[PDB]
C-alpha cells in the first residue's frame, strides 16, 4: 500500500457514494416510468449506468494503488416525489452534494501530498461541473414549460434519446 | 394488469437479484485482495449479469402496468476462508434464488397469470445453468484441494470469461 489508509478510506467512501447515486437515479426512473415519462426514466437510467462506470474507475484505481475495496450497505432510496420538478430538483441537490464531496477528497488528497490520486481525481471535478450544469439546465427548462404539457413531452422525448 | 400479488413477488425478486449483483461484486473485492484477478474478473461478469436479469424483471413490471419499488440493499459479506469457501457461498446463494423462482412460477400459475409464468420460464432456464457454471467450479475446485498450480490454471481460465 502506497496509499495512506486515510486516502483509500475516502476513495472507498466515494466509491460507495456513487453506487448510491446509481441506485437513487434508478429509483427516480421507477417514479418516471410510473408517471408515464419514459424519456425522463430512460435518462435517469443511463445516469445510473454512468455513475456505475465511475465506481469501476474508483474500484480499479484503489487496487492499482495497492489497496482493496469494501462495499457497504445501500439504504433504500426515495421512490416518489411531488412531480417532475420535485424529482429533477432532487437530482440537482444530489449532484451538488457529490460535487462538494469530491472537493473534500480533492483537498484531503492534496493535504495528504498524494500527487497521483489528486491527478486521478482531476477528471472527476471537471466531469461533474458538467453533470450538474446539465441537471440545473434540465430543471430550468421544465420551469418555463409552466406545466404546459406540450413541451414537457418535448423534453421527455429529448432527454429520452440520450445515448 | 398484473395482480398486486404477482406484482409483489416480482418486485421482491427484482430486489433479490440486485443483492446478487452486489454480493458477487463484494466477492470480487475479496478475490482481488487475495490476488486472484481471474476469479475477481469472473465475479465481476456475474454481478453485471445479475444486473441485466434485474432490469428484465424491471421492463416486464412496467410492460404489465406495475411499478418497481427499490428496497434497501443489505451489506454483503466481505471475507471468506478461501476460494472454495466463497464459491461455496456462491452455489448456496443461487440455489436459494432457484427455489424462489419456482415459488413465483407456482404463485403465478395458480393466479392464473399465464403471462408472468411464461416469462419466468426464461429465468428458470437461465437460472438453472447459472448454478451449473458455479457447481462445476466448486468441483473444479474441491478436486483442487491445494495444487495452487492448477488453481492458477483455473484462475487464468475463469479470468477470460466475457
Residue numbers in the entry:
A (entry chain A): 2 to 164
B (entry chain B): 3 to 164
Verbatim from the authors:
We made a mutant named FLAL where Asn147 was replaced by aromatic phenylalanine (Phe) residue to create π–π interactions, while Glu112, Glu113, and Lys114 were replaced by three hydrophobic residues Leu, Ala, and Leu to decrease the electrostatic repulsion and increase the hydrophobic interactions between two adjacent dimers at the same time. Therefore, besides calcium ions, we also investigated the effect of PEG on the assembly behavior of FLAL molecules because PEG is a hydrophilic nonionic polymer widely used in many biochemical and pharmaceutical applications due to its mild action on the biological activity of cell components. After trying different molecular weights (PEG1000, PEG1500, and PEG3000) and concentrations (10, 20, and 30%) of PEG, we finally obtained nanorods formed in the presence of 30% PEG1500. To determine the structural basis of such nanorods, we set out to grow single crystals large enough for X-ray diffraction analyses in the presence of PEG1500. The crystal structure proved remarkably similar to the design model: protein molecules connect through designed π stacking and hydrophobic interactions in a side-by-side repeating pattern with adjacent FLAL molecules antiparallel with each other. Thus, the crystal structure is in good agreement with the above results observed by TEM, confirming the side-by-side interaction manner of dimeric FLAL molecules. Taken together, all these findings demonstrate that our protein interface redesign approach yields assembly of dimeric FLAL protein building blocks into the filaments or nanorods induced by Ca2+ or PEG rather than the inherent Ca2+-mediated 24-meric protein shell-like assembly.
Four helix bundles are also attractive for synthetic chemists because its interfaces are dominated by side chain and side chain interactions, which can be more tunable than β-strands. This study focuses on TmFtn, a naturally dimeric protein consisting of two antiparallel four helix bundles, as shown in Supplementary Fig. 1. Thermotoga maritima ferritin (TmFtn) naturally occurs as a dimer; twelve of these dimers interact with each other in a head-to-side manner to generate 24-meric hollow protein nanocage in the presence of Ca2+ or PEG. By tuning two contiguous dimeric proteins to interact in a fully or partially side-by-side fashion through protein interface redesign, we can render the self-assembly transformation of such dimeric building blocks from the protein nanocage to filament, nanorod and nanoribbon in response to multiple external stimuli.
